[PDB]
Amino acid sequence: TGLTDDTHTDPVSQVVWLPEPGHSHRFQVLSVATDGKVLLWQGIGVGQLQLTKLKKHPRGETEVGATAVAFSSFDPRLFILGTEGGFPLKCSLAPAQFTFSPHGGPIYSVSCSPFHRNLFLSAGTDGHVHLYSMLQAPPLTSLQLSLKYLFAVRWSPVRPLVFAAASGKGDVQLFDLQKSSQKPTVLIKQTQDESPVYCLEFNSQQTQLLAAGDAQGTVKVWQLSTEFTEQGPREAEDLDCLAAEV
Amino acid sequence: EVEETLKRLQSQKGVQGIIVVNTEGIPIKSTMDNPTTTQYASLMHSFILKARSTVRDIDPQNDLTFLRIRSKKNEIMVAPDKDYFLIVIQNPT
Amino acid sequence: EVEETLKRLQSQKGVQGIIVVNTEGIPIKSTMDNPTTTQYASLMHSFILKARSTVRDIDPQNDLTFLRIRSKKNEIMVAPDKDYFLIVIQNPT
Amino acid sequence: DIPRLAAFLRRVEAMVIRELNKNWQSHAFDGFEVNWTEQQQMVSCLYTLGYPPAQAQGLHVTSISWNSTGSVVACAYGRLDHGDWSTLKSFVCAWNLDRRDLR
Amino acid sequence: DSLSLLEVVDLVETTQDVVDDVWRQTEHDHYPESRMLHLLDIIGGSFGRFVQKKLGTLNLWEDPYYLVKESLKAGISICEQWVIVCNHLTGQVWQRYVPHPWKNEKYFPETLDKLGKRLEEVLAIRTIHEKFLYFLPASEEKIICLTRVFEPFTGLNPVQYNPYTEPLWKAAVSQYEKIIAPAEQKIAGKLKNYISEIQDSPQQLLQAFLKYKELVKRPTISKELMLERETLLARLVDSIKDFRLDFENRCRGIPGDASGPLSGKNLSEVVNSIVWVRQLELKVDDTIKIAEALLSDLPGFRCFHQSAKDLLDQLKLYEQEQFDDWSRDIQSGLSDSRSGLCIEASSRIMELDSNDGLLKVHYSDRLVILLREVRQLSALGFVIPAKIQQVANIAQKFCKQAIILKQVAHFYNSIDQQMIQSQRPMMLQSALAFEQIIKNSKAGSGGKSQITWDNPKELEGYIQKLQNAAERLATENRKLRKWHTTFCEKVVVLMNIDLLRQ
Amino acid sequence: MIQSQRPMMLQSALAFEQIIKNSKAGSGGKSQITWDNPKELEGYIQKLQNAAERLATENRKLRKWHTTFCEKVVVLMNIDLLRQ
Amino acid sequence: RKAVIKNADMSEEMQQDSVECATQALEKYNIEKDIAAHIKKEFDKKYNPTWHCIVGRNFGSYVTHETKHFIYFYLGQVAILLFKSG
Amino acid sequence: RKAVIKNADMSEEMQQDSVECATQALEKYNIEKDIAAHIKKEFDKKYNPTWHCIVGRNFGSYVTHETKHFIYFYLGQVAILLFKSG
Amino acid sequence: IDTPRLCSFLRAACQVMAVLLEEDRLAASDSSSQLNTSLPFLQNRKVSSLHTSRVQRQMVVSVHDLPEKSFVPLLDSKYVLCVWDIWQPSGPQKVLICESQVTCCCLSPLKAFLLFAGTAHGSVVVWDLREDSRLHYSVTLFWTFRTATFSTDGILTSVNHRSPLQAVEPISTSVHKKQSFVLSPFSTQEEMSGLSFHIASLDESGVLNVWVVVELPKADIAGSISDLGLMPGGRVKLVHSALIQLGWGTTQTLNVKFLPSDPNHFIIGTDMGLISHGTRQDLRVAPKLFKPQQHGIRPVKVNVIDFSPFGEPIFLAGCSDGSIRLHQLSSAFPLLQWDSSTDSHAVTGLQWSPTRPAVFLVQDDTSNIYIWDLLQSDLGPVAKQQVSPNRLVAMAAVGEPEGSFLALVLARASGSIDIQHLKRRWAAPEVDECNRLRLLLQ
């Protein structure tokens, strides 16, 4: 059990695991403080946490809260914080480098880039999925879904550069980068009068198992075949890198 | 169609024999003697499996596309399959 | 001399890396990254042992002359030798 | 033994430098189309519907995940949108997609 | 000269402010006019020479245009920003801070203005060329040939340009427009096919024009796409029409759908209205600007702008009204009934003859409400009146104890009505021992009511004591619940076992 | 077309030939179109070509049907009479 | 993972239980020794001693079994050999 | 094929036979199942049945043996489990 | 095995083996001749032309035209393209067929994917070379024919211009596909998929045309108009003008030749005795014309144009008066105005030797070939040889710069085919490089 004192009183928005620099069996557990703390600890360390502090212009109107954090598989010390302010903040913890101005609405979801470390997702009230490359923070591309909200995004570094996400209408969109940008290729629907899905996640052990959650206490599994592998899809990475540099 | 092509191939001076191995070392068609037919089917069945594993071990999202093994006496080619592959032996000389 | 010829080979548009496997699957020279250096050396050592045996089994008076493995990702070639073989990988694309 | 190693490198060099280039641009048969699996049909739906029966009547799903190790283990958690600051609101429902998990 | 273009874009603002401030009535009514204008004239002209030199070092002809575009835009911002602030601020500085003879008049020759336009023309030309480059397979011959045809034309307006032979450049631009035209004609054809292929999807249509807007605005292409631009206009009218109706039918915020559920709903419906309207404003505003850029102010736009702008203005008013109510209610509530010595009063048990001790504390809900309230206003770029900041800082001090005080209060009130479900003395007797620990502290309840207000540390001690007991009792409760389930499950199986078979 | 000798396309082809044969009869006045004004001939050949193009399209469609029927038969010869 | 039975000298009911038991053991443990220990102990209890179980990714074996008490099967890439003898 | 005994419940003379038998088996046979079979059979002949042998590079086991008839050792990188049961 | 669903694998395996065997077959200073004159389908046809290749430096094509005498009673098209190799044994390797007179033939420079030819009546055809043998009429004694193309005879367009063609050439200038634009409705890469080179076709009218289409994913029959095969079309078109300076008043062209170095440059010759220069991208680089140090007109009716296959960009051309000029690209006037021996007759064929020295070959009407080696001698022919079986129709010099070889293939009006190898002149190579530089400097 954790503590109840000043260590971590805030109503943390997320919990994430990381590998510890020590033996690979050890995984540190973090939370996303709503107040501006970067909190990491070990198993027994949940009591008397071990690491704590990203604040730009401290002691003032500076309350750096975030709703989600994603970490790049590339390196333990690269991750993005989904700040409530709306502008994604890069942090390596506290240091920070880029403010990503293309996405201005309060963030509800982030995701790290799949392989090649250039397709970093942020999405919030804007309803627009802005990808960017942390190397320079340019607007790479913005999906222009005319939908109320977004609540989850689906990436698989295992698969080619493909995208799907669950939106606050009940539909789940799929996008084949090599075919379309704004037009969903495959779309999964709900029943006639079901309220929107509020979550989406995909099994890390691919096995073509996708799961989403409806407005009822029911989780539905789909077996998807569309995302087959192939030699050549890499082109999507070159297309995005060239767009960024021009 | 396929039988006519196989005959035409066999007529080529380079080709030393053709074996159609179907059920994991069990042939149905051969242009060779029986002892060689059975041995060859077995060897190439095991051999191709090893190559396919090697490729998957190098990268877990790629399989065999083709396999060739060469020797002083003759040269053997096989192709990947879902259910069964075909064996060709030729004299490279 | 040989260092220049290996670089010459490496400069070829097809070639994506060269590994000189010496000590029974443990290389001594490489133009590739470390994970790949050991990955290819180890796997191909196991394979060539199978390939050489395969030739001796199919005919008891012949050794291996050459092997080629093709895949969707890349292609690998090896030749046998008295003490040790060499691995070259190309991009078929 | 450096000159012995060099000698080997010379011999194989002679083979590979010639053989490789000839093969690389041989532009040989390109009709290889093998799948090793039956073609899957259009994406399916409602593969499995896991949930706590009684509790699912009033709750809605807000957090789901899969166990990386036990790929059969699907986790879900529903809750009520309001009152999440005071009372016990829900449970964590897991179900395996494993042998004999017919319910 | 030691500063880059990307930095001086901000210096122009700082320098204008500080110089106008120091001229104020400090030690003397007004410093002699000599320096009053001379220093500003030097500063303005110095920016001119600065930008002129720095843009030359960009090599506005070479291949790395990516970095050039960034630095070039900065150069323009420097030139224009200084002129704008000079012309605006001068009008008030000489009336409010320094009684300078000149009033409601400017001083600056605005040579930066011509320099800024010069760079704007260069940017527009380079940008158009890059847009043609994307279509290089369409106009390959034109793009390659014209590049070198236009090079000697650009050479009529070199870096560090001074408009003292400006007519020469005018001739160069006239030829540019007449010679580049074949490129525009071929691309215009391609664009018509590529846009008209869009099956009247407002989404794809907007993006098609948005991505190549620099080309569409060109006289040649604009006319070729006239039918497509008018078609988009009509659809854009349809869009804001739908938004208007959706707003009107939901603005009251009564059904859950009209508000829009959010995780911040725990503060109040204000957060929902803000986000809801924010989206409406952005969508309507964007459509207005796109129509303006593309239509070139045809009757189609006149009608569209009227309707869409009126809607946009109503949306802005909606937001402000909702905010004003929010702010007023919070300020009123604080001033009315919360500033009056709110304390951490002990559990009012006797009032509720059920052992349900009512820990009547004004801060009960208000702590988290205030924290969310300030978070909302801060994130959204609103000023938080001092009154809220003051009570918020106080709330922080209470929070340190309320987090643990509620725990021990809850355990007491809860255990009292959960242990009775089993009637095992194991729990009923030890719960009384816990109650005794509570009562021991309660012996000083009258004084506990005043601790947190002045010094919460004493209370922390009392709570920790009760929490330690609560941890022991909670452990016993968990064991009890575990066993209770265990025995229930086995008994319900045994009654279903037929002794004659199983 | 002549590889299958389908009476449908054979009849359509006859109708095509009728266009040529009737057009030939018109040569009494049309045999000097090119001399005076070829534009009429451009329309002439395009219309005749269009008829041929339609014929070509119809033929491929019938081939599509033909294949469909073939696909069935090869299935039918793999039916177990004692079970299916 | 996927259960594939290659050889069996065992009743249909015991075959399925062997797979099911190994599947649960594989879900609970990562170490092959501990997986084997679970499988063995469960069989001694339900089907009488004495069973032996070997679990691994790379081995060959030559063993003697009592009739109707031997199975060899895979769970994914891991082979499980289970039999009675003694 | 250097021998290192990790655990044994076996007399020293039987330990020697275990290593010597496996050593000859590994010299003669390339295939794991055949190596195991050689070793098992030699023990059945000299020390009576019923012996069982596992030879491999990656496995865990949990087995029951007759007292004083168990050995587990490596030859190089290959583990050999040799015991009597039944 | 009973099911065709598996026999597909057997087919594919055969296809692989067949190609490998075909690849395996590609094995190896005076008269030393060879003959490859099997007549499996050439019993009555007459030779009309020869063409060599660049992908297979040992490959040659030979055009044959059937007379009214039918060696076979079958419906036998009169126009075929004989494809064979120098080192292969007697017997053509492949054959292509068409309906009308075929000429203006060329091959694909990157790989043997397509074969191109211009029709006598102005249309353009292209055969699919990289196709297995199936759905083609076969004969015993086995030999199989191949016919597959969708000609411009089908869908009507303007690119035909209803004018006979004069020459075609593969234009290796494809440098597009820099990127598919992020907004797909405006991505130009898609339409260039598979396009590695274009094909040019010039007609008598002086109108130049360029296009190419490539596509593999197809099935037996298509909804659009095509042959019943899996082949691309001719939707792409570009048109370029010519004869602006030259142009009763209506002029025509005779020959065109592009620049191997930068294929965007080319020259065009006319009957009026002049050759113009131009290019594709920038049409104002050097719009000059070539002319010798002459006056008046001298309508020598230039009929053969070629290019020296070496670093310095020098074009060569010959005319009916038996003269040849070296029209250096960077000069309006030629370097060496040589009047060939036997100037009393015309130039019938020119070529540059595929060898290290800059040896140049000319054939005349009397079938007396003259050779120059300007690296070691003056403008006088360094060698010559006529033939008793005179009335030569065509020649082509074929060789490869390392194994190496050098050959010369010829054909006679009698319908026979000949070839010999005099590779002693393949290269010094050291002396050749020494004199090569010298000639360039002086």
CA-based nearest residue in chain I for residue F48: I156
Shortest distance, CA I176 to any CA of chain E (angstroms): 7
User: In angstroms, what CA-CA distances link I114 with A12, E342, F58, H83, I107?
Assistant: 66, 91, 29, 71, 7
For residue A179, the chain I residues in CB contact (below 8 A) are: 184
Distance between CA atoms of H23 and H6, rounded to whole angstroms? 16
State whether residue C72 sits within 8 Å of chain A by CB: yes
Residue type, I70: S
Residue extents of the structural domains in chain H: 2-86
Report residue A12 as tokens.
């943390």
User: In angstroms, what CA-CA distances link A239 with B68, C91, E257, I177, I185?
Assistant: 37, 21, 40, 11, 15
Question: What stretches of I339-379 show up as alpha helix (H) in DSSP?
Answer: none
CA-based nearest residue in chain A for residue C91: A231
Question: How many residues are given for chain B?
Answer: 93
Distance of CA I141 to the CA centre of its chain: 31
* Partner-chain contact C46 B40, CB within 8 Å: no
State whether residue D45 sits within 8 Å of chain I by CB: no
Indicate the helix (H) or strand (E) that contains H18: helix H12-28
Report residue E272 as tokens.
């929902």
- What is the rounded radius of gyration, in angstroms, for the C-alpha atoms of chain E? 36
Closest CA to D61 of I100, A199, G55, H4: A199
Question: What stretches of B1-93 show up as alpha helix (H) in DSSP?
Answer: 2-10, 34-58
* Burial (Cβ within 10 Å: 0-12, 13-18, ≥19) of residue F62: middle
CA-based nearest residue in chain C for residue A234: C73
Where b means 16+ CB within 10 Å and e means fewer, G38-58 reads bbbbbbeeeeeebbbbbbbee
For residue A231, the chain C residues in CB contact (below 8 A) are: 72-73, 93
Q: Which domain covers residue C80, as residue numbers?
A: 1-93
For residue C93, the chain A residues in CB contact (below 8 A) are: 231
**CB I163: neighbour CB atoms within 10 A?**
15
Shortest distance, CA C57 to any CA of chain B (angstroms): 8
DSSP E100-148: -S--S------HHHHHHHHHHHHHHHHHHHHHHHHTTTTSHHHHHHHHH
Q: What is the dihedral of CA G27, G32, G34, G40, to 10 degrees?
A: 90
Do I356 and I429 form a contact (C-beta atoms < 8 A)? yes
Distance between CA atoms of D23 and D13, rounded to whole angstroms? 15
* Phi (first) and psi of residue B82, to 5 degrees: -90, -55
User: In angstroms, what CA-CA distances link I438 with A146, A231, I141, I360, I375?
Assistant: 73, 51, 57, 17, 8
* Preceding omega of H50 cis (within 30 degrees of 0): yes
Closest partner residue to D21 among C12, C66, C84, by Cβ?
A: C12
Do A165 and A194 form a contact (C-beta atoms < 8 A)? no
Question: What stretches of E160-298 show up as alpha helix (H) in DSSP?
Answer: 166-179, 181-196, 202-211, 213-216, 219-224, 226-248, 256-259, 270-295
* Phi (first) and psi of residue I370, to 5 degrees: -120, 145
User: Residue B20's domain is classified under what CATH number?
Assistant: 3.30.450.30
Q: Which domain covers residue A113, as residue numbers?
A: 1-246
Do I348 and I365 form a contact (C-beta atoms < 8 A)? yes
* Partner-chain contact D47 A203, CB within 8 Å: no
* Partner-chain contact F78 I222, CB within 8 Å: no
* Partner-chain contact I15 D26, CB within 8 Å: no
Distant-in-sequence, close-in-space partners of C3: CB < 8 Å, separation ≥ 6: none
Distance between CA atoms of I307 and I275, rounded to whole angstroms? 14
- Which three-class secondary structure state does DSSP give residue G15? helix
Instruction: Supply the angle between the helices E363-379 and E270-295 in degrees, to the nearest 10.
Output: 10
Query: E295 pairs with which residues across the strands?
Result: none
* Partner-chain contact I20 D28, CB within 8 Å: yes
Optimal mutation site among I5, I6, I8, I9, interface B, most CBs of chain B within 10 A: I9
Q: Count Cα neighbours of E489 within 13 Å in the Cβ-side half-sphere.
A: 6
Do I284 and I277 form a contact (C-beta atoms < 8 A)? no
Closest CA to H84 of H57, H26, H45: H45
What's the number of domains chain A is made of?
1
In the DSSP assignment, the letter for residue A25 is: T
User: In angstroms, what CA-CA distances link E398 with E333, E375, E391, E449?
Assistant: 18, 18, 10, 13
State whether residue B47 sits within 8 Å of chain D by CB: no
* Partner-chain contact D97 A221, CB within 8 Å: yes
Residue type, F37: N
User: In angstroms, what CA-CA distances link A50 with A42, A94, E148, E419, G56?
Assistant: 8, 15, 64, 37, 39
Shortest distance, CA D36 to any CA of chain B (angstroms): 5
Closest CA to I25 of I95, I94, I77: I94
Query: I278 pairs with which residues across the strands?
Result: I266
Question: How many residues are given for chain I?
Answer: 442
User: In angstroms, what CA-CA distances link A64 with A33, A89, A127, C16, D68?
Assistant: 8, 10, 22, 47, 32
Distance between CA atoms of E404 and I243, rounded to whole angstroms? 96
* Preceding omega of A67 cis (within 30 degrees of 0): no
**CB G76: neighbour CB atoms within 10 A?**
11
Distance between CA atoms of E447 and E442, rounded to whole angstroms? 9
Q: Touching C: which chains, 3+ CB pairs < 8 A?
A: A, B, D
Distance between CA atoms of I36 and I398, rounded to whole angstroms? 15
Distance between CA atoms of C57 and C63, rounded to whole angstroms? 10
Distance of CA D39 to the CA centre of its chain: 18
* Partner-chain contact D81 E368, CB within 8 Å: no
Do A83 and A70 form a contact (C-beta atoms < 8 A)? no
Distance of CA E424 to the CA centre of its chain: 58
Closest CA to A147 of C17, E283, I265: E283
- Which three-class secondary structure state does DSSP give residue I147? coil
Distance between CA atoms of I345 and A129, rounded to whole angstroms? 77
**CB E286: neighbour CB atoms within 10 A?**
14
* Partner-chain contact D32 B63, CB within 8 Å: no
Instruction: Supply the angle between the helices E166-179 and E181-196 in degrees, to the nearest 10.
Output: 50
What's the number of domains chain B is made of?
1
- Which three-class secondary structure state does DSSP give residue E165? helix
Distant-in-sequence, close-in-space partners of H73: CB < 8 Å, separation ≥ 6: H3, H4, H5, H6, H7, H8, H18, H19, H22, H79, H80
Do I303 and I346 form a contact (C-beta atoms < 8 A)? yes
CATH superfamily, domain at H2-86: Protein Inhibitor Of Neuronal Nitric Oxide Synthase; (3.30.740.10)
